[PDB]
Structure formats: structure tokens, C-alpha cells
Amino acid sequence: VLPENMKRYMGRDAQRMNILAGRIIAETVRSTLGPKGMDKMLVDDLGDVVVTNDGVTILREMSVEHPAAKMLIEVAKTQEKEVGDGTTTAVVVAGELLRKAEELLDQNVHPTIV
Amino acid sequence: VLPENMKRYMGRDAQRMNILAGRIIAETVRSTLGPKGMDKMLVDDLGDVVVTNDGVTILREMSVEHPAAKMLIEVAKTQEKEVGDGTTTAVVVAGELLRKAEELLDQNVHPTIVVKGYQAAAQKAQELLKTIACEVGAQDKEILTKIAMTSITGKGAEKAKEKLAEIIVEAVSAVVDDEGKVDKDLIKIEKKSGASIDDTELIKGVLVDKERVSAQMPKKVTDAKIALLNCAIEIKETETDAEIRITDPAKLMEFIEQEEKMLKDMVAEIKASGANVLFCQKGIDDLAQHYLAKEGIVAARRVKKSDMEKLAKATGANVITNIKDLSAQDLGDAGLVEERKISGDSMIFVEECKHPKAVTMLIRGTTEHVIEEVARAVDDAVGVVGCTIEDGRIVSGGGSTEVELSMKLREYAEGISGREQLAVRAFADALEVIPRTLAENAGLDAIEILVKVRAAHASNGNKCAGLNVFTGAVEDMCENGVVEPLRVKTQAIQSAAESTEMLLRIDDVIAAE
Amino acid sequence: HASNGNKCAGLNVFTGAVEDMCENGVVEPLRVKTQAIQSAAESTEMLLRIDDVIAAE
Amino acid sequence: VLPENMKRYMGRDAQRMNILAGRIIAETVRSTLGPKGMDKMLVDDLGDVVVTNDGVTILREMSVEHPAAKMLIEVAKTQEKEVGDGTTTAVVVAGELLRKAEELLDQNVHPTIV
């Protein structure tokens, strides 16, 4: 049905992959979160240097490959358009909130409840 | 310096990779952990199928590639060599313990502190177990019946849990002698499909799956005098090569009559002892069977050497080598020796022994698989009764220990203060995995159960709580006789911590490509 | 079968119509059917017990 | 962890594949089942001809590739060793019984109940 080369994950595999990708990004940016949060230095393949704390900027500039990681990038952009601030906060909090929520799923608590 | 192709990770990268690999394995096996743990089916590239719960087996058979994953495999093997059990437990617990420990590292708590706090809390955990343990009379009739009956309940055999609990306690109590060491070798389990579970019984004697070799033998003997011989009742020959050199016709008769007398004297001597039952290890010539039968002596031939020894122990007969040495003091007693048909098959019953040191529990059931499970049910009941007889200590289950420990350790943590309190606090929080997976594997709400149980335990006490997975509600663990040996929990902690300490000691990981 | 009873029914493949099985002496041993069910169910239970399938390439 | 080349299915994917493979085999042999059941003619790559009704024989002779189909072959052999007859019956009945059972799983009826 699908063109050879296309890859698909479903059910608990789709969930595991998506959560894990989101979590790793969250761990990368969480070090900037808060009054005592620090900054990153990103040097592209061209030599240009960007030093920022902004979650969108960091994620926009970096060159992601994984489709699941590319889908999370949309979250960061929508957060900026809608609210402005809370980009790093929303990603980090959203990750932990999803992780803790999945512990309930494993306990068989319908996600509509959580 | 290093050959191109070699790969190396160091510092926090070496740590991240190693932990993550270990954790994923732990998640793979953790689904087997516990009474409600399930099994896996592994089908190799050849077609062979293995269905097991054993952590080592699963990991040994699978074909790992990653070096870090290959290094963890050594942990599982060492766990088997050192302790035997706790392979899955140690890996799963070790993983979470390492994960929670790394959260402290990120907080900048020196790993020497974390490891020390765990050691300290672990040693204190054993003391607390000894303290909360409820001491009982090793041979208390009533409490023993609860151990027995508690095991039997929830099984096919529960229909006759009262009678079965009775026979099981009695069997162990009889063979244990003093208070006490038990040898489960003195309790035989014979299982034959037919009848129902209600027909199951205990026999203060032995049930042998043999027949009376000759038809002409008596079908009933009362106040039987049993003889246990291991030497064959045949014409003995010298070790040195010999041969008769006949030189007169008178000798053709002389020797024949000589061998007849020797044979008759043999048999005559057995009878002279007053024996009416004889167990021979080797063969019995047909003619000997004939005389034995005419004397109303019951005989059995071709008995196993190991069986000859079990027969001596059970019946209380003394194995004699030379008939010359046999005396009345060597005779054993059996209240009854009788041929019975069980599921059509003929078997011999040695029952009504005075004070038997070996008993048999004949199991009946509507199926082979049923009597097999009933046998397992008893193997456990004997086991747990044995644990209590040797260690007059019992304790509530359903994760009650870990909850007691979590409480007391938290207070102890506050007493110690400093960073060390965080390490002892994490140990107390780590103990919760047991409650967590008990209810998870049971399909109970892990969060809600724990909240209800802990609250109820804090109110009703120690012997008025635990989880009852069967009814899915708090109960009285003591009233329900749902107890385990302290040794189970104590050894589990000991072996578990020593493995965790080994991992915690590593501050450098160098894996080749 | 619900009307005529137990010994006044069955299928008669030969005439392609209901008959009297008893009158026609079209009977089989109980053991055929009993053993068939027993062995059949024990195999189904083995399959039903599997909750994990790991097949190599 | 696993050698590149190894393939794995899990959860509902492992279940779907296994059931489907078993069912197709059942449809192949079910045409022999019963007093009015017919026979098959199997001609190997060598020219040898076998005409039988036996489920084991048909499955033993044929050259299967799929691992899931190879695992079901063991069922047919164990059926022969244990009971003798009911090889075709057990496979066909087992397939439908499993199919109808999965309809209950989709309804969220714990397999321990079914």
C-alpha cells in the first residue's frame, strides 16, 4: 500500500518514540530554565555564532533529522505565536507531565481521566 | 594511540550510555518479576523455542551487540553463581537504584555519600525486619493450619483445604522429630489421577508402586514381620575359580542334594526369624518364590539399591548382608501390608506403622494436571511450615515491611541530617517499587491501593492490613494466615544491595568496539 | 429438532432433508465427540496462554 | 542490541501477524475436514507426488518461509504425538476460536476471562 522506503510506528511504539524524542530535547533546553538558567553557544557549519537562551532559536537553528523531533519543533513555534514566553517552560514541563502521565497509562488509567 | 575502529566513551557519556542500556534490559525482564509475573517465548534463528521466566536464560539466549549491554550480562551470571535467585530482582532494583542515585549526582551529592547512605539504610532495614517480625510458637497447631490452608486456598484443591491443611501439618510434625530441622525427603508425594480431590489423604507409612511377584502369596497379612535383605538368595560361589571333580556315581546325587539343602536352609532360616514379608535387592529364583508362597511369606524382587535404603528408613528394618547375622532386633514393623487397586493399577500399602519417620500423601483428582498442581501446592505448604519451624518468626506481606522501613528510615534521615539524609531518603523512596509492581502485576490501581493500604495500616496496625490481591481490598493478614519467612526478605535485601554496591563503585567504563 | 425432539432430527446428507436418526440407525459413539472436544480445547488453551511472540528473522 | 538483519514484532502487531498466518493455513486444510472432505495433490521440485488428507503431511512436505508459519507447524506435530487424530480439526477450530476470541479483546475483555 505504502511506497517502499516509508517507515511507520503505531500504538505503544509510536508513543514510546514520540515521548522519548520530546524528553531528550527537554533535557537539552532545561539547563536554561529559570533565573539561574545558563546559555548555549551554537556554531553552524558556516562559522556564524549564536549565543541565546531562547528555546525556538536553539531548535530553529539546529538541524534535526528525526521526523518525531521535527514534529515537536512545531510546538515551540506555536508557543511563540500564541503566548510569546514559556517556550522552554512549556517543553520541559510538558515532557515531565507526559512521562508521569504514561506511568498512569501503564497502571491502566484511561488517558481521558489523566 | 588506539587502533582506528575502536570506540570510546568517558565521563558523563560513559555513565549515560551504561545506565540507559541497563535500564532498557530491566524494563524487558521486570514484566516477569513477582507472583503475578508473566513469561516470555523466545524463538531462535533455528526454530528452537524456549519459554521461561529466568533472567539469565533470557539474556544468555538472546544475541546482544552493544558492548555495554554485554557487560551487564556478566552481572546476571555472577548473581546466579553467588545467590541463585534474585537475578531479575537484582537487575530491576539495581537499575532504578542507579537512576535515583544519578538524580543525586546531578544535585552534586558525592557518589561516596549516596552509596554509604544505601549501605547504612540497608543494614538498618535488616534490624527493623527482625524488630517487626511477629514471634510465634514453632509447633502451634492453630497457626500452622492457617499457613497450610492459606496456601491451598485459591487453587483447585481448595474444596478440601481443611482436611489437606490437617494432613500436611501432621506429616511435617511427625518427620521433624525435634524443634527443629525438617528433611522433606521423609515426606513422599504419590499422585494418581482418579477419584476427586476430596479422596486425597495422608498415610502414616509408605505407598509403593509395585506388586506381589507371585500369585500364590497370601493376599492379607496381619501383624507382619518384614525382612529387608540386600544379599541375593542364590547359591553362593567362591571368588576363586572352582569346579567339582566327580569320580564316583554316588557324587552325582551327593552334590544335587547338597545344593538342595543349602537352598532349603536359606529359605528355612528366613521363616525361622518369623518374617512374613521379604524385600530382596537382587533376584529371586522361581523355586524360591514357590517356597516363599507356600510359607505364606510375601516377597518382592529386583528392588532398587536406593529404594532398599528408603525401605530401611521408613519400615525400620535393618539391612543385613549375611543371613547368619540376621536377628529379631533387625526386623521392622508395619501395622498393615495390603494390595490395593488405585485407578485400576495394583500398588502396595504399608500403613499403620507405629511411629513412622517417613509418610506418604496419596493425592487423588479428576485429572493428571490437577494432582500435579495439588502436589506443588503441598510442596509449598511443607516448605513454609518448615520455614516457621526453624525460624519461629513470621511477618506481614503485601509490602508491609517496605512501608515500615520507609517510615522509620525517613525519621532516621532527619536525625542524621546533612547530605547523607538525602541518600537514606532515596533508599526509603526506592523501597516503594515493591508495592508498585505488586499491584501493577495484579492489575490493581498502584497509586490508590498504596494510599488506602498505608492509611489503613497506620490506623488498624501491623497485623490488620496488607494487600489482598484476591479480594482487591485491605484485610487482616494474620487472620488470613498470609505470612512469609523473614529469611526471604532479609536475604533478598542482602544479595540485592551487594550487587548495587558493585555498580555504584564503578567510576570508569572502557568498552572496546 | 426443537419440535420433533432429539431422536427425530439430524441432517441426512444422503436425502438432503431431516429424518429420524434413530429409526435410520445413524449413530456414533460418545467417545468420538468427547475426545474431539478434550484434545481440541487443550490445544486452544496453549495458544490462548501466549501473550508474547518473539520470532527471529 | 540485536544483530542488524533480525526482525521483531511486538504487542498487537505480533498478535495480528501470528493469527493471520495461522488462519490462512487453516483455510488451506479445512477443505479436507469432515466425511465430505477432499484431498490434495502435492508435487515437489523433484517430481515426487503425494496425495493425502493428513494435515501434518501436507505441512511437513510444503516449504514454508515465514517464521510465524514455521512456529504453527510445531502445533501440528505435537497434536500428532499427543492425540494422533484431530490435526486438521484442531488447527481449523483453533483458528476460528482465536479469531472470535480477539473480537472480545477488541471489546476489552481480559484474555484470562475468554
XYZ file of C-alpha atoms in Angstrom, chain B residues 41 63-65, chain D residues 1-3 71:
8
model
C 8.602 -17.029 24.375
C 22.096 -12.193 20.791
C 23.318 -8.833 22.070
C 25.580 -6.494 20.061
C 21.362 -4.635 20.888
C 20.190 -7.044 18.180
C 22.242 -8.026 15.103
C 6.005 -21.911 14.596
